[PDB]
């Protein structure tokens, strides 16, 4: 129908501290979760079946991300490293060293030959996956970097920071193409490209999501009604059924908006702490949500629409 009817299907228990990030594998088979407990867990996407724990970081993990072929993970840790993992073997292939403070956010490019990282050290780093070498250090921001993301052809990087800026970077040169949001405040807590790479979805810590036209540098849509003043809460484009925007909230709910109309079309109740991370399954109408340390669970929700 015109509205989704997401209902709780599974609750995934096992993390012993706050969950930080959940991501579906591109092939749809797996959910990966990262946590302040220093662990990555892999779960069945469709039945929530616990598969394995992946360990090696010396401190908490803020983010995890999948290679395009679903074979590798990269994790971002308070131990100042990223780690590249073979999902099949659970083994650490590379440790990426160079950030001088917590690594907060990470992503592969579509090619999955590069990793982009953002740190509390106010830099964005670009890494070679094959060698684990740092190729470029961008002096991107003047406060912690909250999010980094490649566009669909890999030619662009978008970054966000507590400095209140969203910047777009030329991957090849590392040179800044655009400062898309230029305010002293509020902090920009999350950014990502739209699937078609024309738009940027940006969260600010004034309880606001905004869809920006990258080329024109203009705000096309605003999404409000949720609570976001403190945490770097992920947001998603839901594209498998109706065209939604999805975000967690500091009132312990998952919010779903109609992308075009900006109306709230569902609020998902069940979590007992801040919903820090949501993910949308690549082929099925399935959302994964994850909560901070009062809850420490992941929930899988399914919709007919
Ligand atoms: O959001 C925070 C930072 C914070 C800590 C303490 C107080 C206020 C803020 N931590 C939660 C875990 C990490 C969540 C996360 N990782 C990557 C993203 C978006 O790219 N979001």
DSSP letters along 14-60, please? --SS-EEEEEE-TTSSEEEEEETTS-EEEEETTT--EEEEE---SS-
Distance between CA atoms of 206 and 223, rounded to whole angstroms?
11
Indicate which technique resolved this structure: X-ray
Cβ–Cβ under 8 Å, residues 47 and 305:
no
Among 170, 114, 105, CA closest to 138: 170
Structure tokens at 209: 């999501």
Cβ–Cβ under 8 Å, residues 231 and 274:
yes
Structure tokens at 242: 């109706």
Contacts of residue 84, defined as CB under 8 A and 6 or more positions apart, other chains included, come to 72, 73, 74, 92, 93, 94, 96, 115, 129, 132
Neighbouring CB atoms inside 10 A of 166's CB total: 27
Return contacts of 74-78, CB within 8 angstroms, 24+ apart: 74/106, 74/107, 74/108, 74/115, 75/34, 75/40, 75/106, 76/103, 76/104, 76/105, 76/106, 76/117, 76/118, 77/38, 77/102, 77/103, 78/102, 78/103
For ligand 1, atom 21, name the residue with the nearest CA: 232
Cβ–Cβ under 8 Å, residues 195 and 152:
yes
Structure tokens at 145: 């970097």
Span 1-305 CATH architecture: 7 Propeller (2.130)
Whether 65 lines ligand 1, by a CB cut-off of 6 Å, is no
Instruction: Examine residue 293 and say whether the peptide bond preceding it is cis (omega within 30 degrees of 0).
Output: no
Backbone angles phi, psi at 10, to 5 degrees: -145, 150
Among 269, 229, 263, 223, CA closest to 247: 223
Classify the C-alpha dihedral 50-55-59-64 as positive or negative: negative
Q: Which of 118, 231, 246, 291 gets mutated to test ligand 1 (max ligand atoms within 8 A of its CB)?
A: 231
Backbone angles phi, psi at 8, to 5 degrees: -65, 125
Contacts of residue 89, defined as CB under 8 A and 6 or more positions apart, other chains included, come to none
- Tell how far the Cα of 192 is from the centroid of ligand 1, in angstroms: 15
Cβ–Cβ under 8 Å, residues 233 and 219:
no
Whether 266 lines ligand 1, by a CB cut-off of 6 Å, is no
137-150 as b/e, with b when 16 or more CB fall inside 10 Å? Answer: bbebbeebbbbbbb
Among 255, 249, 252, 243, CA closest to 285: 243
Structure tokens at 106: 């990470």
Cβ–Cβ under 8 Å, residues 104 and 116:
no
For ligand 1, atom 20, name the residue with the nearest CA: 147
Distance between CA atoms of 132 and 115, rounded to whole angstroms?
9
In ligand 1, which atom is closest to the CA atom of 147?
Answer: 20
Q: Which of 232, 293, 296 gets mutated to test ligand 1 (max ligand atoms within 8 A of its CB)?
A: 232
Torsion of CA 178, 227, 289, 3, to 10 degrees: -90
DSSP codes joined into one string, 179-227: EEEE-S-S-EEEEEE-TTSSEEEEEETTTEEEEEETTTTEEEEEE-SS-
Residue bearing tokens 């992941």 = 298
For the chain, what's the residue count?
A: 305
Backbone angles phi, psi at 50, to 5 degrees: -60, 130
Distance between CA atoms of 250 and 257, rounded to whole angstroms?
16
Q: Is 195 left (phi over 0), alpha (psi -120 to 50) or beta?
A: alpha
| Strand pairing category for 30-35 and 40-44 | antiparallel
Neighbouring CB atoms inside 10 A of 20's CB total: 26
Distance between CA atoms of 88 and 71, rounded to whole angstroms?
7
Distance between CA atoms of 56 and 53, rounded to whole angstroms?
10
Whether 232 lines ligand 1, by a CB cut-off of 6 Å, is yes
Cβ–Cβ under 8 Å, residues 269 and 290:
no
State the greatest distance between any 2 C-alpha atoms of the chain, in Å, as a whole number.
50
Distance between CA atoms of 238 and 285, rounded to whole angstroms?
8
Distance between CA atoms of 51 and 45, rounded to whole angstroms?
10
Angle ∠(247,253,259) on CA atoms, nearest 5: 35
Cβ–Cβ under 8 Å, residues 95 and 77:
no
């Amino acid at each position: 129908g015109s509205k989704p009817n997401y209902a709780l299907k599974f609750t995934l228990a096992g993390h012993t501290k706050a969950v930080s990030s959940v991501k579906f594998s591109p092939n749809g088979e797996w959910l990966a979760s990262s946590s302040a407990d220093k662990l990555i867990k892999i779960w069945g996407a469709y039945d929530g079946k616990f598969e394995k724990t992946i360990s090696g970081h010396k401190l908490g993990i803020s983010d995890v991300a999948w290679s395009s072929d679903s074979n590798l993970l990269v994790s971002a840790s308070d131990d100042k490293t990223l780690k590249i993992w073979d999902v099949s073997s659970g083994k650490c292939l590379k440790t990426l060293k160079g950030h001088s403070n917590y690594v907060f956010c990470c992503n592969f490019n579509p090619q999955s030959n590069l990793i982009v990282s953002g740190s509390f050290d106010e830099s964005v780093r670009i890494w070679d996956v094959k060698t684990g070498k740092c190729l470029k250090t961008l002096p991107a921001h003047s406060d912690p970097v909250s999010a980094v993301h490649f566009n669909r052809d890999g030619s662009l990087i978008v970054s966000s920071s507590y400095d209140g800026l969203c910047r777009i970077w030329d991957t090849a040169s590392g040179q800044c193409l655009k400062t898309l949001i230029d305010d002293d405040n509020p902090p920009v807590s999350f950014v990502k490209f739209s699937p078609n790479g024309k738009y940027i979805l940006a969260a600010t810590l004034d309880n606001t999501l905004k869809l920006w036209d990258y080329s024109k540098g203009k705000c096309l849509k605003t999404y409000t009604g949720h609570k976001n003043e403190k945490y770097c809460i992920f947001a998603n484009f839901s594209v498998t059924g109706g065209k939604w925007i999805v975000s967690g909230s500091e009132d312990n709910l998952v919010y779903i908006w109609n992308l075009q109309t900006k109306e709230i079309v569902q609020k998902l109740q069940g979590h007992t702490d801040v919903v820090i991370s949501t993910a949308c399954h690549p082929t099925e109408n399935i959302i994964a949500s994850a909560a901070l340390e009062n809850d420490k669970t992941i929930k899988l929700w399914k919709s007919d629409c």
